Amino acid sequence: GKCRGLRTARKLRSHRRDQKWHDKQYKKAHLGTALKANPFGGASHAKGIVLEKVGVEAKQPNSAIRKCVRVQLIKNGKKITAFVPNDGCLNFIEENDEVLVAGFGRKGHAVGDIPGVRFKVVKVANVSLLALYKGKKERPR
Amino acid sequence: GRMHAPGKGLSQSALPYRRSVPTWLKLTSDDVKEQIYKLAKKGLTPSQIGVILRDSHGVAQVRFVTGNKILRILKSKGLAPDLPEDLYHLIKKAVAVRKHLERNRKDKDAKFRLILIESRIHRLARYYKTKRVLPPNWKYESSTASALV
Amino acid sequence: VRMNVLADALKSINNAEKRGKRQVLIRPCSKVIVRFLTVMMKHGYIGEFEIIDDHRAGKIVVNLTGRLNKCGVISPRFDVQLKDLEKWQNNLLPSRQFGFIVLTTSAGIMDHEEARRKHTGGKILGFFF
RNA sequence: CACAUGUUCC
RNA sequence: UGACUCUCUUAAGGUAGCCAAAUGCCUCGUCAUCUAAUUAGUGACGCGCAUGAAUGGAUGAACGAGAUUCCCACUGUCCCU
RNA sequence: GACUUAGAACUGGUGCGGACCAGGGGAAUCCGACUGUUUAAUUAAAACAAAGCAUCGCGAAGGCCCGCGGCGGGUGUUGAC
RNA sequence: AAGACGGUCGAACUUGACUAUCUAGAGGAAGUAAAAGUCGUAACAAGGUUUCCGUAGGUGAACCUGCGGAAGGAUCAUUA
RNA sequence: CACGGGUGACGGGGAAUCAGGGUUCGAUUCCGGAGAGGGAGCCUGAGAAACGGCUACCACAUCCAAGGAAGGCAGCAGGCGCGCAAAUUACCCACUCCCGACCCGGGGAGGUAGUGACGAAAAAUAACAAUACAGGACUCUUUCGAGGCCCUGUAAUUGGAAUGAGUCCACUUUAAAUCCUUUAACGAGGAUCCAUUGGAGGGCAAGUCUGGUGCCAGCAGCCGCGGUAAUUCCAGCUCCAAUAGCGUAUAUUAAAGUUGCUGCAGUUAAAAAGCUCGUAGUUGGAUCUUGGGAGCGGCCGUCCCCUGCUCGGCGCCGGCCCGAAGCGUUUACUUUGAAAAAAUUAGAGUGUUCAAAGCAGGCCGCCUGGAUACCGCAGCUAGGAAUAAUGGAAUAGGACCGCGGUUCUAUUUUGUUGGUUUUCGGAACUGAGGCCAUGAUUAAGAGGGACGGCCGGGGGCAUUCGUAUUGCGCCGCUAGAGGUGAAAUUCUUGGACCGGCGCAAGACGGACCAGAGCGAAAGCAUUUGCCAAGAAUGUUUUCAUUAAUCAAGAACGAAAGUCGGAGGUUCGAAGACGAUCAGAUACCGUCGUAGUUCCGACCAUAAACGAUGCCGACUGGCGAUGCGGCGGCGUUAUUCCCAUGACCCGCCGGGCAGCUUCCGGGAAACCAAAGUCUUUGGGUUCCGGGGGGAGUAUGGUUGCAAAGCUGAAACUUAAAGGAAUUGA
């Protein structure tokens, strides 16, 4: 602190209050716009409806094709290009099936080779995709 | 460190340690006071009585010879002016700048110089308000200040 | 202008101690500074001081030894309870073996050990070791 | 007096 | 489509602005709105037969017995006398 | 010695600026700034005028124009604001 | 007792205005992310007109020019 | 920081998390408030604006015979919807208490169970011995190898020993149960009664193992792997981390000294507003009581005193001693005491077998416990007088000691009965007194002001000079003259260019001119005059804290630009033309509008830079320079020397700077400040939180306009950037 007066507590508190708004983490957590733009709305997981499967081209040097799914929510109606987590799992997903979509772990930032996707699929048709890969569960058909 | 100048000069008086009366001075306290009353009667601000007394009359300081200082002696006999000397010369200086500004209104340097005295006048005005040597409703008004010399 | 007087005195003799002057002059003389100098002398941190009492704020010439590391000042004078006085010396003094926090109490001006003996708190003044 | 430009990996 | 480039020509080859306008034949131009239905009106699009800068261009607060479009209310204009 | 204003109660078939006097309003487009003037007897307007703006000539034996005529006339009882 | 009269609290209805959020929209101007696209080469070496800032104008385009500044310039230096 | 708006806000006790400080949460068992779908009104009752009470409207919903009637699960269950998200339409008043006329009846309060990897505590998934071996401390053996006095481990090698999980009865438990414990019998050698979840390039522990894949599939929080030898993809072996738990997403905390009070940074990485003034706000010079004495321990350490002025008893001879009550500048601050719900927190005791827990329990009826701590911040009371505040008397309505007169009045008293006046106790007023040691700290290497001699491209007004440039007049002589890298555009026998003499106009102020001076900054250069101002120096001159930084606000503010006039020499945005080039719409050259010049108003932006806010102190020297002052040999002018000028040698204050070094600091460049900083605090403003979006949109405000001030988010990105070294 610069001012060191014996009764400058309201000056020091106002400076710390104002300079907190210049912090990226404080302004994100204390503004309605950050929560408005979030499709989850503070939710850890959400259910959505598959309307199409979208292939996403990769970034600089590492080049491949990433398998994604355009997920449309039920609680908000917004559309999310969610990423299919593991290898060979797009054969598991079908059209017009409800999916449990969460984040991937970077908390609102595009992850690695995939451009513009922050979301991954956990459960499909109330059946876990991890057990589908392991063969522990079979899709009801 | 002047408050309206960037100068940091060091030039002021320095009294000697001893407060005793000089050995060459044979003028008693009342003889100094009647000399002070003579200079104050013919018109003289207390700064100037101290000046010429140490020049011709050879006194070191009035506070050491008499019991009081120059302004305090005039206040006892009521010969002190209505308003103090440092505010008087600031108002006199402010009148001269404003009178000069009437003709030379292109003088932006003199225009900037005008606020400094009015800044300095108000600092002396509110200080003398707390010392109760001026009336509590006294206020320096620029248009009617030309009546005072 | 000169807001605090003890702060200017302590930093002036700290600059002389860093250079290692045999004695140092501080321009103001105050009752607090004289009381401050008597606290350090009983512990032998400095050489013997003397004041030059003119008809103004006097000047103090303090003889210096080489036993002083740093004598700081805490501004403003925060009041110190008996409960957190251990907390004050934890993050200010170098160790618990030595280092002295002096702070003014109603009984007078003394270091933190003597304030514990008299069981009296007060406002902090500075630290020195 | 003019000397404009030549995809990415180590 | 086309910034760009080649080329013929004159004294300059229409710049800023504006437009189906009191100025556009094609034309009832195209799009949106106003309607149940609009060759009318408004806002945009400009390859403008033949817009355009004191032969003044654009703008348009206030006003106009100046010329048009729509709405509320009002009524024998009309149903139908 | 006054007229004016405000308030309260009661009351008449909700009737009360009771006759007379007496602004329909709103949203837009084009044009002209406006007040004004104009084809007496078909066109009151977007036409004319208007302030504002920009040019041209003239220092008097001069610019402009009148007069059949003359040391004729006006601008001019004027002089670049 | 039903009921009527007047007063008070007063749900609620109609109409009108204001405001919060979402949102269609002919047309228009932006930013971001790829291109082995096209046009040129502004800046980094005096980058071939030294660089940059403020303010105006012009031009397909980076940009150019005028005026005044700064070196973050290629000069801490040049003489009776 | 009123009012207003939002609140993804019931509040608190408290919860998580922290060395210290803090951050986040608190719908949730205790307290208090609000409600029963949204309002509104009411009856009864002590207590309701009650809804497991009515009365209406609104919205939803029910039966109907179509006339009518009737409802409020945010009470326990339970059903639908909503969701990522949350249990049984179970039993019982046996415990806790509550209600009633009451020992007796009632309680979806509550208790007991069921579901239930919310979570927490305890804790299975094995142990021993023998054979082969791989070996370890010892003796011999120079090695080899030996016995195992002592062992350590490995091997579906073998062997019995002990229990649980489950089957399972008796008892207990409980209202009836259930679970746990006890009890019998069974119940394990691959004790098949078989433990999973992630990963194996780095952080980060653990294969350069095998095969397939070939920038495809895919992996990967990040860096990064994959394009035919993949330590990173898919499988197998093996190994590593936790272990009935593990992984992932979301949100928060610490790490974050990346929000910095503790405790950040601001010259170059993010940054000090262009500068100044300026009321709030914040911070503020020194100075008003130290010392002595009685006692004890080996000059030092410890206790008491420097308090003053109604009622009683160690009492004693009007006075003295002691005890009690009251008054004695006010705070902040410090110490103490009371009042300070529990639960929770720390913590005493206690073998729930341990522990999470709980408040019990232990001994041959007794012994006992069920503590203690804080409750800040706020309020009360009591000791202290350092620090930080406020105040006393200097026109004295100043403090004490007796008072004199005036007014009313408690009255004790006139023996009682009645008037009066006063001694008398109280309150107030007025005049003469006596006395004070009769009442004034300092003048800050703080500030303000006065004065003296200067000083300065400081500012404004007027005046004056100087070339040069342009144009014109005249004269002379001429075929070229301008301009360029080179040419051309341009002028030219109608005489260009050049020379000379002049005239007129408008700009500008060279050399002198400097790491010099002045000014808050922008900025300021011909002579002279006028007006006002200013720093520094000198001062035994005046006031006495009048001070420092400042939001709101205000003044000035380069150039460019705008509006009115004046004037437009030169230069010169735009534009025209000639060159260059692939093109020039640029750089070059000839013209040239606006502008550049003066006056009156706007505009408030600069690389407005020292890229370095302002006030105060300290910390090395060295030679200069500006001003003022001081001292001194001497050279030189007025001349006729003192004194003043010009030099020379030093000293002082600050004024701009420079040089130098291991003060010190910094990432370094470098810095006398960019130091006196993890040994972190002198004071006060402004301002920054990776890079873009973006100084953009919108909103507000100013401006004639241009544009000026304030000022986002969506989204995107793993780097951008600063200093320095080596190559190119």
Q: Are B69 and B100 in contact (CB under 8 A)?
A: no
Q: What is the dihedral of CA C120, C121, C127, C129, to 10 degrees?
A: 30
Give the whole-angstrom CA distance, residue C77 versus residue C123.
5
The topology under which CATH files domain C1-68 is Ribosomal Protein S8; Chain: A, domain 1 (3.30.1370)
Give the whole-angstrom CA distance, residue A63 versus residue A65.
7
Q: Which of B64, B6, B1, B65 is nearest to B34 (CA)?
A: B65
CA(B12)–C1'(E53) in Å?
Answer: 75
Chains A and B touching, counted as 3 or more CB pairs less than 8 Å apart: no
On the CB side of A1, CA atoms within 13 Å amount to 13
Q: What is the dihedral of CA A41, A42, A46, A50, to 10 degrees?
A: 40
Closest protein residue to H690 (Cα–C1'): A24
Q: Are C121 and C112 in contact (CB under 8 A)?
A: no
Element (H, E) at B62: helix B62-65
Domain ranges of chain C: 1-68, 69-129
Resolution stated for this PDB structure, in Å: 2.9
Q: Are C71 and C84 in contact (CB under 8 A)?
A: no
User: For chain B, percent helix, then strand, then coil, each to nearest 5?
Assistant: 55, 0, 45
The verdict on domain C69-129 having CATH code 3.30.1490.10 is: yes
By C-alpha distance, the chain B residue nearest C53 is: B17
Q: Phi then psi for A71, rounded to 5 degrees?
A: -100, 130
* Cα angle, residue A55 at apex, residues A53 and A59 outer, rounded to 5°: 150
Give the whole-angstrom CA distance, residue B15 versus residue B63.
12
Q: Are C57 and C28 in contact (CB under 8 A)?
A: yes
- 3-class SS at B73? helix
Query: Is the distance between the Cβ of A112 and the closest atom of strand H smaller than 7 Å?
Result: yes
Beta bridge partners, A103, equal A119
Q: Which two tokens stand for residue B129?
A: 């308000």
